Structures are given as C-alpha cells and as structure tokens.
Amino acid sequence: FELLHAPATVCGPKKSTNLVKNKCVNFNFNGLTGTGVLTESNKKFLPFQQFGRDIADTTDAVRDPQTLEILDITPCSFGGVSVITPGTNTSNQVAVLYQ
Amino acid sequence: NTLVKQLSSNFGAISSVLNDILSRLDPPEAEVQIDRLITGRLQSLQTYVT
C-alpha cells in the first residue's frame, strides 16, 4: 500500500466528530494531523486536488473529505515572553511584556 | 529562504514532518529517524549563525 498519494477512500476503522471553527485545536485530515485555526477560505481549488503547499511547503488549506469544504490552516503559536525589571535593589515588581 | 528549504529535506530519512513519523513508527524504533532530522538542522543553524 502507498502513503499519502491519492484522495482518501479506504483508510481504516475510524469514526468522525463535529467541525469547530475559530479555534486553535488539533485537526486530522486524510490521516495527516496538525494544529491550527480552521476558518473560511477565499482561494480557488480544483475538484481533483486535495492538499496544497505554499512557499514554505506547509499544508495551508486541506479539503474536508466529508463535506468538500476548503478550510485554511493557521497555527496560533505566534508570540513571546519578555520580562523587564528595574532591579532588585529598588522595588520587587516586574513588567510582563509580550513580543 | 535557505533555512525554509531545510524543513522539507529528509537528510537521509523517510519523512520531513514530525507529525508523520510518530503516526507510523513506534517510539522505541523511531529514534533513528528523528535523530537524522535534528542533526541535519543543527548544521544549517550553526552555518547561519556563523
């Protein structure tokens, strides 16, 4: 058997849940897993195409094999932590700054 | 753009995605495939900083 070469039509004994949008939850389309926010789509896709790669070679939009709806993929891992303190000799307070 | 292309190379492995190898190989046997992806990226990061 092959791995990731054609639209899903065999697979194995796996059920299905509901579809939630505007959330950074884990998804699983065509066996390939991932983590990102699934929102609306405004691009153009052909009926015989499923996955899609950009310049970074990352699945940004996968087609739902259940409803044939294009959903964009965008991970919420976008931030940083930076603590700024004036010094322990003055006071004992800090300032939480995000990147 | 050079570091972006390093994420797609296998560096002598079977897959360049960390979510794909774990879904097909058991941890006690996938240690030989994850090490090839980590070692292949340390050379690009060391060269970039240099």
Binding site: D54, I55, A56, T58, P75, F78, G80, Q99 | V4
Partner: peptide, 28 residues
C-alpha cells in the same frame, strides 16, 4: 505632514511571507 524633507522622501522610494516566516521561529 511628516518631519522629513524633499530629499529624504526621494531616497526612500529608491530603496524598496511576513507572517509565514514567523511561524517557524524567525522573529523580527
């Protein structure tokens, strides 16, 4: 409206993927 001269505005036009690169660790 800006605090620049006409010479500085002419040189700015001579010297001319934002969030996609930041999804891997490239923080500007």
């Amino acid at each position: 409206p800006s605090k620049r001269s006409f010479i500085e505005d002419l040189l700015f036009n001579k010297v001319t993927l934002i969030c996609a690169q930041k999804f891997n660790g490239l923080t500007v």
